Structure 1
Amino acid sequence: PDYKFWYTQPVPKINDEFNESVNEPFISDNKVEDVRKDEYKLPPGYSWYVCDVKDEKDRSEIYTLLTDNYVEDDDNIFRFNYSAEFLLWALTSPNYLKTWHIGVKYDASNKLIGFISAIPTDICIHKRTIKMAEVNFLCVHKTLRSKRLAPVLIKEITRRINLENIWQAIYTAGVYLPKPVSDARYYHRSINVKKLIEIGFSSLNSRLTMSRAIKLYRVEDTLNIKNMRLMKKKDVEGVHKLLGSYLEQFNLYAVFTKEEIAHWFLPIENVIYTYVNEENGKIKDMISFYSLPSQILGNDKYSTLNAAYSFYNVTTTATFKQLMQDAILLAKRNNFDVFNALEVMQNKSVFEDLKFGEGDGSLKYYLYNWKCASFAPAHVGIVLL
């Protein structure tokens, strides 16, 4: 309601509205020379720590911080449990900066209690392509909440990003902040029906008994696209063209280089899954989803919901519904308990037919130091991890 920190930032106020003809920074003509070279002050006993995510132990420290203190669902059934290998993948995209992986340590115990990260990427917003920082994994230890640490983390990473002559950022959050460019409800498609019911996430009733639910969400183990296969390095050029052509229709997408295609789509077990359909030497269809377990809080039987998240999907030889049906089948074949997707790109058009259930909240999309018209989530063409 007050937004005492955010109203000091170059972001729209809660009731700011810009028309289609506006697509520019809040603050332009920025000079790297003018960026502060001193780190932001922390409370005494706390220190900045540049994390080396390629070091296993530094990476484990981030993993522990997030495992115990990161995002929980609105009902506190779940907490995200990003794997250490996933964090490596998420944070070492091409041209990434290790100095954008910022930790705060409590000196007395030498333990990480705060973290924020960013990676650089070209973001096309309303047909204008801007080098941006993609901010993610902001986390403050549960014991230090509501002490205004997050503004310090946000301001410090803003400074480090500005030092690289980058003045815009993209980020997402479940909380409402000034001010979303788009707002995206999330949906789920049950796969391990019995498990989702036992943990308390899915519901039954007289019409949907346990056995009828199991039958309803059972899938045929046959791809609509017969030759969908795991992506290999030979497909990077093909995927780059297919996805790149698909994404230009949207109001907000990342302009991937081939190097970025290789990093973000070549498969890593329990991290990122991409399947392709090659015809006549061309990649004509692609499915991708990443692995993001939710820890199941307090649950005696299960400690982990193995969830797959829809990443990027393009079809030219099938319908989008058949493609996503295959996406669900491919996630099941890989032992995921649930398939999750946002109402971005074409996704909403298949949610009813493919038996998705609507979730309880939404993911908001944001830009930093950019004013433009907002848009319905079907015009969003980017998924942040």
Structure 2
Amino acid sequence: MDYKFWYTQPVPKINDEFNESVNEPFISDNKVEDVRKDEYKLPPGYSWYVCDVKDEKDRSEIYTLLTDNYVEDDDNIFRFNYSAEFLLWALTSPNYLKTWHIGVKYDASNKLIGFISAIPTDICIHKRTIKMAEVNFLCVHKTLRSKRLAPVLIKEITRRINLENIWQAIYTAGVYLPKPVSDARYYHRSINVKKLIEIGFSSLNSRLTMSRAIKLYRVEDTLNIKNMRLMKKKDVEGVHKLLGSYLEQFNLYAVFTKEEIAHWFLPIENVIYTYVNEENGKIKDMISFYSLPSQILGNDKYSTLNAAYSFYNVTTTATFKQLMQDAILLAKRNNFDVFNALEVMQNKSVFEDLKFGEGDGSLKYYLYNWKCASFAPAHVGIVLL
């Protein structure tokens, strides 16, 4: 389109394409002492608000904002419905800053109508490891859309991040903006087939009757890796090493510390599931997925789609296909209707054999203030939430 906000930002032009050997900021040499110390102006009757995610009430108000106003599917039949407990997990990682959790309230009602967040994470992009901010959960109330509020939120978080002497960020969106480093399609592996058909997430063709669709997706309730168990505190060193060593091969991935591994993977009911296979006290395989339910808009029978999203999966003792079959099965065991993944890492390789369907769109990966060659998604080794 025209991208009049994005064009003033340190990000590539729509027509920019860089050699593999390019790996550097757009703007280097930045200075904390020069960063604006004043908050971005909001329109009359609107105020900044510092959200304390560890306060139940503040967390609940972010949760209602996103519940009613967050990302929908193209046909406006489903809306992402991140739980409050998920938000807590997502936003309170190691060394997080409360003042990168940014709310906008409407003066007169005192109601939260806008939100944007970031967490600090070490990102390796093309073998350069950079302190970055991972930005998520940008949201403006449906009644206030197209008012140019989203650039005010962006600019204000950029200012807040810059104050910490961080100059790059990482983010994903479904919408095309200037300009993806990678673009990954999503795929859906049906578990509760009939519910999926009923709510219009999946469809039948005459070759596929209801009974046939149900047989097609039926799994065996027996793991390929018999000893796969919920991760415990004792497993953090092992997971750190297994995941840490695996991720080195990709062009884009998070460099997790131990403290990060514990946060990111220790299980929490209805938010994050990690399973491990220990052999001789060494952690040899792992599976992880997170819970992201979709609210079903206007379906008489169901109000929630229970969905599991693939997180980080590593196998040394089985085929990746066997690993990801077990991950489908562990998801089913925890009541999920569907197992979603992106075509990142080695995922695409198993999608056909494990009966994933292609979805309807793709997820773009972005860096802010970084110049580098774009790449196919199989070179992406990071999953954002």
Q: Which residue of 2 aligns with 1:177?
A: 177
* 2:89 aligned counterpart, secondary structure: helix
Q: Deviations over 1:298-348 (max 9, x none)?
A: 111100000000000000000000000000000000000000000000000
Q: Which residue of 1 aligns with 2:92?
A: 92
Q: Which residue of 1 aligns with 2:345?
A: 345
Structure 2: distance between partners of 1:220 and 1:204? 23
Shift of 1:167: 0.1
- Of the structure 1 ranges 359-368 and 198-207, higher mean CA displacement relative to structure 2 is found in 198-207
Shift of 1:231: 0.2
Q: Deviations over 1:157-190 (max 9, x none)?
A: 0000000000000000000000000000000000
Structure 2: distance between partners of 1:21 and 1:318? 35
Shift of 1:21: 1.0
Structure 2: distance between partners of 1:382 and 1:74? 25
Q: Deviations over 1:58-90 (max 9, x none)?
A: 000000000000000112111000000000000
When the two structures are superposed, what TM-score results if normalisation uses the length of structure 2?
A: 0.99
1:192 maps to 2:192: yes
Structure 2: distance between partners of 1:250 and 1:75? 34
* 1:262 aligned counterpart, secondary structure: helix
Q: Deviations over 1:124-154 (max 9, x none)?
A: 0000000000000000000000000000000
User: How many residues end up aligned between the 2 structures?
Assistant: 384
* 2:124 aligned counterpart, secondary structure: strand
- Of the structure 1 ranges 68-77 and 133-142, higher mean CA displacement relative to structure 2 is found in 68-77
Fraction of identical pairs, as percent: 100
Poorly superposed stretches of 4+, deviation over 3 Å: none
Q: Which residue of 2 aligns with 1:228?
A: 228
Structure 2: distance between partners of 1:201 and 1:160? 39
Q: Which residue of 1 aligns with 2:130?
A: 130
Q: Which residue of 1 aligns with 2:335?
A: 335
Structure 1: distance between partners of 2:343 and 2:25? 27
Structure 2: distance between partners of 1:127 and 1:300? 51
1:301 maps to 2:297: no
Shift of 1:29: 0.4
Structure 2: distance between partners of 1:258 and 1:63? 29
Shift of 1:293: 0.2
Structure 1: distance between partners of 2:77 and 2:285? 36
Structure 1: distance between partners of 2:54 and 2:306? 25
Structure 1: distance between partners of 2:295 and 2:32? 42
Structure 1: distance between partners of 2:361 and 2:380? 17
Shift of 1:285: 0.2
Q: Deviations over 1:182-224 (max 9, x none)?
A: 0000000000001000001111111111000001100000000
Q: CA RMSD in A?
A: 0.4
* 1:95 aligned counterpart, secondary structure: coil
Q: Which residue of 1 aligns with 2:117?
A: 117
Q: Which residue of 1 aligns with 2:205?
A: 205
Shift of 1:276: 0.2
Q: Deviations over 1:250-290 (max 9, x none)?
A: 00000000000000000000000000000011000000000
Structure 2: distance between partners of 1:184 and 1:75? 20
* 1:58 aligned counterpart, secondary structure: helix
Structure 2: distance between partners of 1:322 and 1:253? 24
Shift of 1:383: 0.4
Q: Deviations over 1:226-260 (max 9, x none)?
A: 00000000000000000000000000000000000
Q: Which residue of 1 aligns with 2:8?
A: 8
When the two structures are superposed, what TM-score results if normalisation uses the length of structure 1?
A: 0.99
Structure 2: distance between partners of 1:310 and 1:261? 16
Q: Which residue of 2 aligns with 1:46?
A: 46
